[PDB]
Every structure is written in structure tokens, then in C-alpha cells.
Amino acid sequence: EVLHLCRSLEVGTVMTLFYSKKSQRPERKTFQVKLETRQITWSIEGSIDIREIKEIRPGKTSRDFDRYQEDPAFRPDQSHCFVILYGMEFRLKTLSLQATSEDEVNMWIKGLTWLMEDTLQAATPLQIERWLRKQFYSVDRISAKDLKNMLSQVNYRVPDITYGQFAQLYRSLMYSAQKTMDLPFCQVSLSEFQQFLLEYQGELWAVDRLQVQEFMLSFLRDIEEPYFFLDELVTFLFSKENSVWNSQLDAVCPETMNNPLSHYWISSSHNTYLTGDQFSSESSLEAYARCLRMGCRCIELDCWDGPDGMPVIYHGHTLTTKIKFSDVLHTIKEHAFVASEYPVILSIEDHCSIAQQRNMAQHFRKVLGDTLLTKPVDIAADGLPSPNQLKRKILIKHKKLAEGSNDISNSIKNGILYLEDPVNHEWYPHYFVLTSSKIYYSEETLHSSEKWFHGKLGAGRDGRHIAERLLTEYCIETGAPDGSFLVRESETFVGDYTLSFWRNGKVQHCRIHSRQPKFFLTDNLVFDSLYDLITHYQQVPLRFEMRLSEPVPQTNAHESKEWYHASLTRAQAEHMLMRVPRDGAFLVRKRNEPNSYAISFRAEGKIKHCRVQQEGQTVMLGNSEFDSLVDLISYYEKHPLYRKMKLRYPINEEALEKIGTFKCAVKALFDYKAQREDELTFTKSAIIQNVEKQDGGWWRGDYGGKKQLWFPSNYVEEMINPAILEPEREHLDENSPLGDLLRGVLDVPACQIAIRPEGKNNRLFVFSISMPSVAQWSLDVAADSQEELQDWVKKIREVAQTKIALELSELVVYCRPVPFDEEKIGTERACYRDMSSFPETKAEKYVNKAKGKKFLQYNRLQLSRIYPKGQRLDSSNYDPLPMWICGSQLVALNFQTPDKPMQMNQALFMAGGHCGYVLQPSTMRDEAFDPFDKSSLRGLEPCVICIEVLGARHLPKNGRGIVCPFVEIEVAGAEYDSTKQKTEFVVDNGLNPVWPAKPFHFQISNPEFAFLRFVVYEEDMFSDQNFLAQATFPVKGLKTGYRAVPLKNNYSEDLELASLLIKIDIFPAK
Ligand SMILES: [Ca+2]
Ligand code: NA
């Protein structure tokens, strides 16, 4: 049926790919489903893993298609286009496709929709097989060296081949690698597995022998009576079918959706339109689609006047992009109820004029129609309606008319300006924020190329011995074929070259003549280049006769790179690097031992050293293997080496001399008597002022009463500009408008400002900040436009000397914002329709031991909305548990951020499959309950959990090496139920590690507000702990016995095959 259709998508459809890259023109390609692996591939140029697909959207609504909405280059059609949104992160990737006919689109939509659901729900062995298929096709047949490299890429350290052999090899390895696990229980019969389910797992259904039979067959899929091989039993222990999570809880229980809305935790998003940070990230319709599909129910719109009478949405007074209110409203309409039938609240932060408010209200009614909530559910009620009563409804939260009528918001100027790096002298962007008192700025925001050409090795018998060594070393160690070769400059015949190749265990040298152009071996053909000559003899033999084969790679290319030092001690490296005022300064130095190097680098004002060993044709950094030092360093110029630090500044003598234009002073190194009338006369140590710097050997400056006269530049030393140095991060406002992004603070009244008319350093619009009381202190700042330069200067200079539309108010039925009045709580004055909102800092004043009970009482009748403080420009999140435990319902989090709070959010709303409403337990909505008084629980049964971490499979990599994994186990809830514990780490294994015996015990007094959290970290070579994977569960949904913990990434998306196996017992039993 649909199966026949899916087989047809294997053939190949030609469709136009609208690339996400704003430069790549739309190209046409042949798209095929690969059912073997459950992928989509196109001409192979690209690949989508179907398990990563989140939405298959008929039509032309994507950024890729939007690039051509006006442009006639291409005309996306509603009818001939669809979008595949897929990925592991909040920001999904998109594959936007235009087909030649409506029937093709419908085919792909229909087929992929089914492959999406089938791939996600597939039995684990099928997932494993598809994983192996994908691994194999990554490398018919493969070599064993390929195999060692392939296993290293999947986090396994290995201390002809066909796929079948590979499959069996993987199978044996996973089982043998974890034999040692304490499993008190070559074939397992349907009766043995049945007893296991009943005796260890507490699976009561299993007493029905036939269900056990069907259970095993649902897992195997491949029949007489079912059984498991031992390796298959262990595979099952790790599988999702054996998950610690009771999937029953995934379904909504209508009976728990009948309390008033104030009794529910409600999945809530802060500034939903944003995809990244609060200052410059892109606003996107996709963020609304993403949040609503994650189960979010309360989303936020920041409305500002748009250009044509309709509001746009962006973060006011920042560089975040704008999107149209109309487009947002249609996105909401399309996605609000895909994941849940339950009501959506629109929190409107309205900055619009009355006229554009009026258009909003009109558009709300036109677009949403009956979906919009315009009347109260029950004018006689004494409390908010239930989620069940508001199904399929959208509520407007907006400030409402009475009848008949220090962050970047409180900021003078915000923007991106460029500062000049004092080490590499490039311009980099930084966030700048001017307040009424200060500037805050943030942290940064032909043959030569060939492998066989080794250049000049030596100048006598030197070069020949070196060439022989390199070639012998290579051939023996790698078992290289005869004809493996390299080329060098001839030591004997100037201008000529010498070829060395392997033959019968021995090296052969052949002179390559160079003449003018003609290159030729003796008595052989002539060629126009040395490249052509070698390219020729790699295809046909030279005269024995030997065809050239494998090029010997250069292992010593580092010797000429600027960061390499062949002779340099540890202390000498530290002295050089402590002179560089930026982290990321680095160098490589050879050590006294053979085959030993050290990377020395500056991080956090301190120098650190890590060793690198040469091992054959490769280098080792920890367990991370690279082809050479040059490749190692190149990798860590593009990927962090230490914490978040990349290798940035190669440090040698020249770099240190250049570490370094407004009223600059220089010190004279020697006397100079003016040789000409326009030249300056001075003595050694004279300070020359107002210097005008210029290449050519001559600068201009003032001294001895003479103004702007010339002098040799090599006669002076530049006085340091203290502004290049790093501000003292020790003492440095922790809650500036930039939050943790802060780098520097300027006391504006103590500064002067001036525009440089000439610009500077290939920037046109530049001003200089100075401080009259700190000579030589100056900061050159570039802006992107003269207009921005002008606005910045006058605002800085000035600091240094110093109605609601009824049509819209009508739509606010519930969620009516009023000022919080503590004294109305619990009185007849409290109104169930009125609500208040709390920045996270004000909220902490009510969710503490003193006021928390009073806040619970408030929240039983009325909604409160919590949102992050303004200083979280990075879009970090606050801990939501202290708010939830005082009954707060709308605890708004930045959904784009993969931090722990959002992992707790998606964990909490697992109860009900992310419908977005979780009924608060009865014990909390009781008069006695107090989140900071364990005694308020009365006679609630507590919970004791005993856990042992036995092993893991398919742990994700973190960079190039092999993870050394350890697992942290946390219970999260009230303060009195919260604690953490952790295993030891395992050495060099993420694919199938097992852990020592370490029984953990957790005790939970309030199991109704409690989460069990597993975080897998690595212990890296610097002894830092780096996140690898994660799984957080509500305690109520936990099963017992030997259970799998399926792992997720930091965005709470499922990782392929990654899981722990634990022994988990819960008391009292139930
Ligand atoms: Ca807002
Ligand atoms: Na167009």
C-alpha cells in the first residue's frame, strides 16, 4: 500500500533543491530514499537521516523558499513544493524542494510521513542494523585499518572484511566487552525470559505466556518458538523496549484535565520568536513552530510598529531581526494544536501605537476565528476554567483597559562595534551598551602543494640519508607497496631534483633533471613541470621498471610554521606567552625526549602545557590521533582544545614585537640630531608626543617645543597602551546589562571621545575613547557606518557630561495583567481572572521559606508568570523548580537554550506526552503544604531508590578522542530531596563501557515533585568534566529491575542507540 509507494521513492525523483546557503543558486538533483538505512540522499552529494526528521511541511513556507519570494529567479509554488525540517537541535535544518508535478510532492509527503513514524518506532535490532549499514557505507569490502579507524570514530579504542563479517564483529564486541556485568541470569527460552520478566522486572502481564511470545517477536522480527541468544538478551537490556520509563504516562489522562487552569504547570516560552541570544540572534517563524511542537502552550510576542501599519516582532532596541505579526499569527494557527489539543496562551508584550494595536485585534479575529477565546467560559465561576473546557482555544494575554479607560531596555544605546585585537591586529565585533553612567562591552561575538614533494631535506649526504630514512620508515611501518616515493631538491646537482622510491625492501634514487623548461629522468621522456613528470609515472612505469604508487607524507611540515619552536624550554615558553594579553596564544615546542612535543598556551591568564607524541606516521594527544602536528594544530584552530578555547595566536619573536593611535607617545632609544628642517631633535629617553605613525621608516611627533616634526621610527619604542590589557575579571559586575557576556566596563564621565577622520587599519568609521587621567590609554572603536559612528559619539559625549486600543483590550478575557497585591491573597478581593508577572529576581522574593506558602495560596486561584531577568543576554535559563514547587504555572524559559532548566521542562511535561499541562499533585494544593518544611507533607509515603550503573552503549563523542565516561545521578525537587552522586570514570571507551560496583541510594520525601536525572560526562585530558548525554524522568514514571536509560542530547532529543543499563530498585514496592 504505502509500502509500494516507499519502494518507488528508492528509484529517484528530480527536484529543485533550494539551498539554505544564501549564495548557492537553486540546483536540481535526484532525490532517493535509501530504505536499507532509512536515509534520503541526492546526486552522493548529501544525506538526511530519516530518524532526524521532525516535520514534513507541504508548501513553500521556509527560509530557503523565502529568499526568492520577490526575486523572479525562482517562483516557489504552494502546490509543487514541500519542506523537510530535521535535526537534533532547537534550530532545525531544512531541505526545501520544488517538484515538477503535484503528484510527486504528494508521493514524497505521503511516503516520508510514513517512513518518519516507522523509523522512529522500529524495533531496536532493526535500528542497530540500520546503524551498522550506515557505518559500513561510510568507509562491498573494507580493510582492517579502515575498521580500526571506523571504531575509533564511534568512541571505541582498538588496543578483506565484508558487511556480514562486520555485523558479526560488532555483535561479538558489544557482548564480550560487557560480559563482566553482574547479571545473575547460549540460548534463553521463552520460559526463561518469562521468569525474568516476572521475577526481576516486575512485569505482571508476562505471566500470560503468549504475550511474552509476542513481546519477544516484536523485538526480534525474523518462525518457531521465540528465544534470545545471550548477546540478544543483553542487547534487550540496553534497549528502549526495556526502558526505565513507563510509556503509559505518555498518554494524556482527560480526568486530570478538569481542575482550574491555576492548578497546572504550563509549558511556557520566553521571547519565543528568538533562535539564539537576546541581542543579535535571528527572529524566526520556525521558533514558534518548534516551541509549539515541543508542547509549549504559553508563547510570547514582542510587538512593535511595522512599516505598513502592521506590527513586526523583534527584541526592542537590539539587533535581532524582525518578522511580521501576520506571518507569526499564521504560524501559530498552523502549529498550535499539532502536539496538543489544550489551550495556548499568547503573552503579548505590546509596544505598538494605538492604530497598529487596532489592526492586531482585527487580524487576531480574522485569522483565528472561533479558535480565539473572546468570551468567558462561565461568567458565574469562582475560578479559572479547566484545560478540558479550553481545548482548541487560543487566549490573549495583554494589558487591559479599565472600563471607559538596569538592562538593555533601560539603555541609551545598544549595538555592535569592532575592537582591534592587540595580538593579530584584526577587527572583531563586540556588544556595546551605553547607559546613563557606563559603557559595557562584551567578549567577542605546482608541485609545492603536493604530498610527495619534501623540498630540501639536507645539503650533502645529509639529504640522501634523510630521504632513505623517511621512505624506509614509511614503507615498513605502513606496509607500503613497492613504488612508494618522495621527491627532494638534489644536494649534488643544483636546480635538479631526486626521486626516491621503494623496490624489493630497498630505496632507489633517480635524478630528475631540470633545464631551461624541461624535466626528465635520465634517458626518459621530458615534461613541462615536475608535477606532470610524477603524475605521468604514477600511471605508467619508469625504467627494472617501477610505477610510482604511494606518496610518502611529510611528517615534519611543522618545522617551518610560525608557531613551532625546535629549541625552547617550558619556562621559556611561559615567559613568551605571559607577554601576550589574550587567551588562545599558543606555541608548539620540541622536548628533550625523542618523539615528544608540548603545546603551550594561555588560558585564563595562565599558561598550560600538554604533551604530544610522534608514533609512526601519526601523532597522539591523549587518545586523540592525528596525521601530523600540522594537522593536530589545524584541527584545534577550528575546534576548542581546552574548555572553549581554540588555538588562535601563533607566538614567535615577530608576534611578540607587534603586540600593540590617539595622542600616542614614544620613548627615544638614542639621541637624534635633526638632519633636515622638518626633522625632530631629541635625546635618549625623551618622550615624544602626539605621534603620527607611518610605514616607510619615519614618524611625526612633538618634542622640545617643536610640533609635528619627523624622526626615524627605529629610534623609538612605543609606550604601552594599557587599554590592550585584559580588565580584571575578578572584580567585575556580575549583573551588568550583559550578564556573563561582560568583558569590560568604562566609567564614561572619566572618558573623552574623538572621531578619527582618516579611519584606521582599513576601517572608515572610527572613534577613540581616552581617559584624561590615564595617559596613553585609548580604545579605537570602529562602527559599520558614519551614521552609527556619529550617533555613538554624541551619545557617549552627552553621557560623560551628565494608551491601549479597545479592539484589543476587549480580547483579554483571562490572564488580565494587574499589579501584584500580596494582601489580596486568600481574600474575597482576589480575582481569578487577574494575573501578575515576575522577573526571576522579584520572583525569588516570594518562592523562599518565608513567602513560599503565601505564593502557593496565590497560585491556587491565580496565574503567575515567571521570566528570566534582563541581564541574561546569553539566553541562559534560571532553575524552574523553585517556582513550580510554589505552584507557579507559567514559568517561561528560553526554549532555544539546551541548558538544564529546559531539560527539566521537557522532563516534567513527559507526563502526558508533552500536551503542555501537568496537574499539580493534590498534596501541594493543600493548605498545609510548604516547600521549605519537610514536615508539611504529613503522611505522604516517601520513596527510596537504589541504583547501580552497570554499563552504557553508543555514548556520543566529544571531539576527536575517546571519551572517558562517568555518570552523574541526581534527584531534583524540593531542596530537602535534592542531592547528586557519580560513578568513577572509565578509561578510553564510549562505545561499550562498564563501571565498577558502586551502589547509590537516594531518598525522596516528596516523590510527587521529584525528578531522576542521569547525565553522562567525560573526564577529559585536562581533568574537566564535559557533557555527553542526558536523561531526566519524573519519579512517578519509573520502573524497576534491570532497565535501560535511553539517552538524549542537551536539547532533549533522542540519541541513536545511546543508553545506560542500570539496576534500579524502588521502595516501597508497588
Ligand atoms: Ca518580551
Ligand atoms: Na519569485
Numbering used by the authors: 21 to 63, 69 to 164, 170 to 189, 207 to 232, 247 to 283, 288 to 470, 484 to 523, 544 to 614, ...
Describing publication, verbatim:
The 13 phospholipase C (PLC) isozymes expressed in humans preferentially hydrolyze the membrane phospholipid phosphatidylinositol 4,5-bisphosphate (PIP2) to generate the second messengers diacylglycerol and inositol 1,4,5-trisphosphate (IP3). PLC-γ1 and PLC-γ2 are phosphorylated on equivalent sites, Tyr783 and Tyr759, respectively, and this phosphorylation is typically required to stimulate phospholipase activity.
The 2.5 Å crystal structure of essentially full-length rat PLC-γ1 readily explains the autoinhibition of the PLC-γ isozymes. In addition, an internal loop of 25 residues connecting the cSH2 and SH3 domains was removed and replaced with a flexible linker; we refer to this internal deletion as Δ25. The crystallized construct therefore contains residues 21–765 and 791–1215 of PLC-γ1. However, in the case of PLC-γ1, the hydrophobic ridge interacts with portions of the sPH domain in the regulatory array; this arrangement is expected to effectively block membrane engagement. The active site sits beneath the hydrophobic ridge and is readily located by the bound Ca2+ cofactor. The two interfaces between the regulatory array and catalytic core do not overlap, but the sPH and cSH2 domains within the regulatory array brace each other through the C-terminal portion of the SH3 domain that lies between them: picture an arch with the tail end of the SH3 domain acting as the keystone.
